[PDB]
């Protein structure tokens, strides 16, 4: 995904416009569930990976199951899925959030 | 004294005008910065500019320090009369 | 031929169908010699650039040489072109005596001054073309009433 991003965005511009504000959602989750950042957590990184993979299937823009429709949906949600994976990376979840 | 050398891509008139306008813009901006940094913590212009309500630092500069250069069609004021701006100036006067 | 000629001077007289070369009008006024026409136009003959500028205008005088034929050429292009020739020539003389530069004069003997004023117009045009005087601006308030 990093290589795909570097092809899509030469001249290195990170700023982009996408529908869900993942960082603010994470901040809201932390404050809602009274997460203490100084303690070890109970989140399994495999659970993180599986949850992201299952979530990406429910964000459907092009509905279908033909190869043409699947290609259309992948093209329609490529950038947002790249952003989603980058944010919900397991190491970032374990260290930062 | 013809000692001015033209800048590449520009005419002699163009380079002279560029230097003059640059000097005057530097003067106006420096006086504006002085006027800004000499304000007070109770000043109402600062109150209405810092909070973003209405006004700007250029307006404060024009009120306090210097109104600045006046331009017509992007150039300095032209020679309406024969080689002079007004009947109160000598001919061929390029001063500020 | 156009590339060698360069610039030519023409005059748009009122109540005439299209343009006329200036030497034709000067001849129609009654001046035949190029020396006399250049006396009326170029005041100081020690100006070779002005002389060269006016030379292509005089090269249109290779054909026309007399007042009668010049008047015929001028009057050929009236508001209603005539079926005869004497009426056309009379119309040409009438236009050059009544509608060209009325402020100089309208009497019978006004040609000697109309020629000088037309020469002044041509001279000022040459000065403008040579870059010796600034072109006028319509927004100057000395040029308004």
């Amino acid at each position: 995904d990093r290589e795909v991003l570097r092809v899509i965005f030469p001249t290195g511009d990170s700023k982009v416009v996408l529908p869900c504000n993942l960082l603010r959602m994470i901040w809201n989750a932390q404050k809602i569930f009274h997460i203490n950042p100084r303690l070890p957590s109970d989140l399994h990184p495999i659970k993180v990976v599986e949850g992201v993979k299952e979530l990406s299937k429910k964000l459907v823009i092009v509905n279908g199951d033909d190869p043409l429709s699947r290609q259309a949906q992948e093209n329609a949600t490529l950038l947002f899925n790249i952003h989603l994976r980058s944010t919900l990376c397991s190491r970032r979840m374990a260290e930062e959030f | 004294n013809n000692e001015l050398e033209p800048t590449p891509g520009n005419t002699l008139r163009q380079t002279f005008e560029n230097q003059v306008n640059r000097i005057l813009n530097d003067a106006r901006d420096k006086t504006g910065s002085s006027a800004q940094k000499s304000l007070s913590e109770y000043n109402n212009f600062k109150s209405m500019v810092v909070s973003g309500a209405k006004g700007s630092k250029i307006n404060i500069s024009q009120v306090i320090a210097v109104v600045g250069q006046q331009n017509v069609e992007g150039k300095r004021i032209p020679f309406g009369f024969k080689h002079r701006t007004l009947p109160h100036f000598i001919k061929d006067d390029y001063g500020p | 031929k156009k590339s060698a000629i360069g610039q030519r001077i023409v005059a748009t007289l009122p109540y005439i169908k299209q343009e006329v070369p200036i030497i034709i009008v000067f001849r129609a006024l009654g001046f035949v010699s190029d020396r006399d026409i250049l006396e009326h136009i170029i005041y100081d003959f020690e100006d070779p650039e002005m002389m060269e500028m006016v030379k292509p205008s005089l090269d249109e005088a290779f054909v026309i040489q007399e007042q009668n034929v010049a008047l015929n050429f001028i009057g050929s292009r009236g508001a209603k072109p005539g079926v005869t020739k004497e009426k056309r020539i009379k119309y040409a003389k009438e236009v050059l005596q009544k509608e060209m530069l009325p402020h100089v004069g309208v009497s019978d003997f006004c040609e000697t001054k109309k020629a000088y004023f037309l020469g002044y117009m041509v001279h000022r045009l040459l000065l403008a073309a040579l870059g010796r005087r600034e072109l006028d601006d319509r927004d100057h308030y000395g040029n308004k009433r």
Binding site: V4, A72, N75, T77 | - | -
Partner: protein, 209 residues
Amino acid sequence: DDEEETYRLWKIRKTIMQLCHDRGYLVTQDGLDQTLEEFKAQFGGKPSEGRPRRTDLTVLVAHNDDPTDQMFVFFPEEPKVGIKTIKVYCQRMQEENITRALIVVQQGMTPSAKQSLVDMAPKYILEQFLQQELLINITEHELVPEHVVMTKEEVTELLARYKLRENQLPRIQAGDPVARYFGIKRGQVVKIIRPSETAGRYITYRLVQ
């Protein structure tokens, strides 16, 4: 100059090699990538009174799906190609049993020759390319997104999937530069693949009409 003429011939040859590679014909890597010195050595570094005389540079190549379907790339030596030159080329194609051919022109072709090229369209297919139009590859320009020619099976599947009649697709003229580069006739559909700022990729379709 001789150096400039060699350079122009080499650039035209390289662009035509790239064109044939894109059109699916079988051009090898060494033919695709020739240095200027290699071309000078192989076919004359002196054009004027030299071995390369806008002839012997003609290219015959066979399509990757059918060695029987082959294409010519002819180099007329005349600044204005004429009716008799077109007839000579068509005779050579007929005798070699070749259907399609390209023709790179020095300056231009007379309208009579162009119409005599159009007339034999079902019998033979010939295209005119100017010398200036091939010094560069328009496909490599960054403003030009990738184009893919779609088969009739892929068109039919696309139309059925979206329930579209061919009137309802965007169009592209048969005189388009890229359309001429790919050699596309009316009724074929091209596919455009380009990156997007809001999605990351976007596939469009154009109908040649």
